[PDB]
Amino acid sequence: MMNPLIIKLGGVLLDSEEALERLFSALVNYRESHQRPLVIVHGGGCVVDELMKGLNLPVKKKNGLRVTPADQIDIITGALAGTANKTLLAWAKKHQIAAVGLFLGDGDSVKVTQLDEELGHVGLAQPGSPKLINSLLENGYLPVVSSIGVTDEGQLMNVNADQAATALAATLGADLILLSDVSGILDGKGQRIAEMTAAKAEQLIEQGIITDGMIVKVNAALDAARTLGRPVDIASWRHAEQLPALFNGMPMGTRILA
Amino acid sequence: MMNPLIIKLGGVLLDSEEALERLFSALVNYRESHQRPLVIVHGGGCVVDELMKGLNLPVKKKNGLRVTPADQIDIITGALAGTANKTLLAWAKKHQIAAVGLFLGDGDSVKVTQLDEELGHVGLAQPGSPKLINSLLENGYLPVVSSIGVTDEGQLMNVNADQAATALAATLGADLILLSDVSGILDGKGQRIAEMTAAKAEQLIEQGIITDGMIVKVNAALDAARTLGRPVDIASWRHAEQLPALFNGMPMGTRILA
Ligand SMILES: Nc1ncnc2c1ncn2[C@@H]1O[C@H](COP(=O)(O)OP(=O)(O)O)[C@@H](O)[C@H]1O
Ligand SMILES: Nc1ncnc2c1ncn2[C@@H]1O[C@H](COP(=O)(O)OP(=O)(O)O)[C@@H](O)[C@H]1O
Ligand SMILES: CC(=O)N[C@@H](CCC(=O)O)C(=O)O
Ligand SMILES: CC(=O)N[C@@H](CCC(=O)O)C(=O)O
Numbered sequence A, B: 001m002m003n004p005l006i007i008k009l010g011g012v013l014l015d016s017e018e019a020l021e022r023l024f025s026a027l028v029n030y031r032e033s034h035q036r037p038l039v040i041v042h043g044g045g046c047v048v049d050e051l052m053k054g055l056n057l058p059v060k061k062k063n064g065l066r067v068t069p070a071d072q073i074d075i076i077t078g079a080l081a082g083t084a085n086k087t088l089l090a091w092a093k094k095h096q097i098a099a100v101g102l103f104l105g106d107g108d109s110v111k112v113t114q115l116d117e118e119l120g121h122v123g124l125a126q127p128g129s130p131k132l133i134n135s136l137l138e139n140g141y142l143p144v145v146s147s148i149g150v151t152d153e154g155q156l157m158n159v160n161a162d163q164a165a166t167a168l169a170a171t172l173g174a175d176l177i178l179l180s181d182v183s184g185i186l187d188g189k190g191q192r193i194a195e196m197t198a199a200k201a202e203q204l205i206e207q208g209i210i211t212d213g214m215i216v217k218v219n220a221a222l223d224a225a226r227t228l229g230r231p232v233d234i235a236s237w238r239h240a241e242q243l244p245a246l247f248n249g250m251p252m253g254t255r256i257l258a
């Protein structure tokens, strides 16, 4: 089988029925026209931010990573490993896609350990075993993986989805594309930056151009690019007409060069 | 491979760390001493009742089944398919058990359709395809399945865990044991009833002895018993010393006769 292609899904578009319908329409068209096996890794920081409101809880992110206290890991796991994951599985079913929902601990796909006591139950993701997912792919299923993981001691961990995607990419030797709610990395004037290198990324970060979630995203992209030795793109899945070319490997956002 | 044994886990014991540690200890001991493949199906009505409190929402059950409005299916899916499911996967990991979390729609394991518009997103579970789970079992994994499902049209459905377990039992041609927070079905004086038949069940229900969740449970048990042609037990997993004999097939609660 060919090297898989991991499509990481994130952004506020995860809360759009029209966006999801358009996306799954394009996924089906791609699947039925390409032999390359697909794997979906999803985030859902928005679903969490909403549930923390209905719950009246605060949201603190220490440089892109959400502080996850022990008293909030269950709620977060519910939102990400449950709600977000099963919502995507429902859309796949609606589109006759045979999918299987998983989290990082299934088949030890992605190894996770506590990153920093200051962050709480936030995990550091690293390559695991590709056996389970490789078998699922060889049997014709579309794995849909959340970013919740678990340590060997049995503690649930919240992994930022971008880092989970990169770790899984190395595990599977797969290509990676990071889809968000913005047309790639934007510059000081808010215009799309076509190509990105580690040196340029550093500059923009120091200048304060790349902040919050995009800092974590560009770093995960660079890691994947140098690890896989292939370019990694950051693009938007907001506009239907661009979806086709996007999956075809066309530069639609910011291409991260190894 | 032998016919699997589905262990359905429910009750308030799902909220007990001591109970969970004791249970997984006995599961490991059973697994390492029996060739019969295990499959876990879990409920978690308690996790839901708590989340509906922190949210300040009402809980209505029309004869054992929780009314699930469209505006609550995502929250419920989060609690059951997410929190409850991943909590059990963490305990399995803690005990070196290679498990894989699934929901009813994975591999179309259990077919689900809307049961009644009066109930909202509550599903009617029926046998599906045993291919995915049979493969997981043959590869050495312990499937841990939640009771959330999805219709062919892509709508998430809340299935009462007892009914999901029975449907999966028929699908896999597996034996079934329903574990709860009570020592089986109790009579008018609150004493354990050793054996149960369809005729006796009807009587007790009409008399008001068997109510709420136990009505759904005894009915699912009877269906499984007549469908599989084998006895189905309803017992408690509260006391550690009883766990061994329980899994060994000893009468610890109420044995449902076909
Ligand atoms: N230079 C930048 N270019 C583009 N987006 C940026 C930049 N700096 C910060 N962002 C923020 O990063 C967000 C995307 O990251 P995030 O919210 O974590 O979503 P996700 O990871 O689910 O795709 C964009 O919505 C934007 O608000
Ligand atoms: N005759 C009865 N015998 C035993 N338990 C009963 C009976 N009638 C009602 N119950 C209730 O059924 C409950 C178990 O059902 P339920 O709460 O749905 O838990 P679960 O399905 O997770 O095991 C018991 O805790 C008890 O409160
Ligand atoms: C640790 C951490 O930041 N986690 C992410 C996971 C979801 C995502 O990437 O969208 C979070 O927002 O909670
Ligand atoms: C429909 C329905 O009653 N669902 C169950 C599922 C969990 C269980 O059986 O514990 C419920 O309480 O929400």
Ligand SMILES: [Mg+2]
Binding pocket: A010, A043, A045, A162, A213, A216
């Ligand atoms: Mg993000």
Ligand SMILES: [Mg+2]
Binding pocket: B010, B043, B045, B162, B213, B216
């Ligand atoms: Mg019940």
